[PDB]
Write a protein that binds this ligand. Structure first.
Ligand SMILES: [Fe+3]
Lengths: 53, 49, 59, 53
């Protein structure tokens, strides 16, 4: 009987570690939420009657 | 026949230690290291009013 | 292995490919160990009204 | 004759889908086009009359 490990092959349903400062790979899901927050943030009121701060 | 050595090649399977190309403007793939290095330092939006 | 190492250093790894004005706020970061020789920057002609990156007059 | 399915292993060329708000994975081409030109300032109103939220 053969399996993915028996032939030094990646499992049919396999996952990679999230990317780090030096190695690539997936991104963490909350990182995806973060970047989707950065683009089109609609975070609060940007200006109130032309006033900020 | 005989003593046969089987790896991911003869079955055309991905290696355990295999990586895909980084995503491009029109391609889907891994997220690059420097992309995360840019992402993390990017401060989250400030929630005031 | 030494030949492959020096050749891979020579050919380089692209940090950003595309186009942007590179104005206030935009930045790029990387691991310092990836830097062995230096950095190279390539600029081109652009259109303010059309916002399409023309391909000539590089620098 | 054996191929990746019989040994229960991933194909030589395969995809891992995109990363969602709760799942890891790749990034959509739109995400890659977004991040490189994504900028830090998001501005907004931080406080009005000593009250936030
Ligand atoms: Fe894979």
């Amino acid at each position: 009987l053969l399996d993915a490990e028996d032939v030094h092959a990646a499992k049919k349903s396999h996952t990679h570690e999230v990317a780090t400062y030096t190695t690539d790979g997936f991104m963490s899901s909350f990182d995806k939420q973060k970047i989707d927050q950065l683009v089109s943030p609609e975070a609060g009121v940007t200006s109130i009657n032309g006033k900020t701060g | 026949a005989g003593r046969v050595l089987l790896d991911a090649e003869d079955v055309h399977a991905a290696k355990k230690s295999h990586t895909h190309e980084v995503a491009t403007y029109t391609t889907d793939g891994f997220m690059s290291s420097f992309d995360k290095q840019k992402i993390d330092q990017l401060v989250s939006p400030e929630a005031g009013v | 292995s030494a030949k492959d190492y020096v050749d891979t250093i020579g050919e380089g790894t692209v940090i950003f490919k595309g186009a942007n004005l590179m104005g206030a706020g935009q930045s790029f970061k990387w691991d310092a160990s990836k830097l062995k020789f230096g950095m190279t920057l390539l600029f081109s002609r652009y259109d303010a009204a059309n916002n399409t990156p023309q391909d000539y007059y590089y620098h």
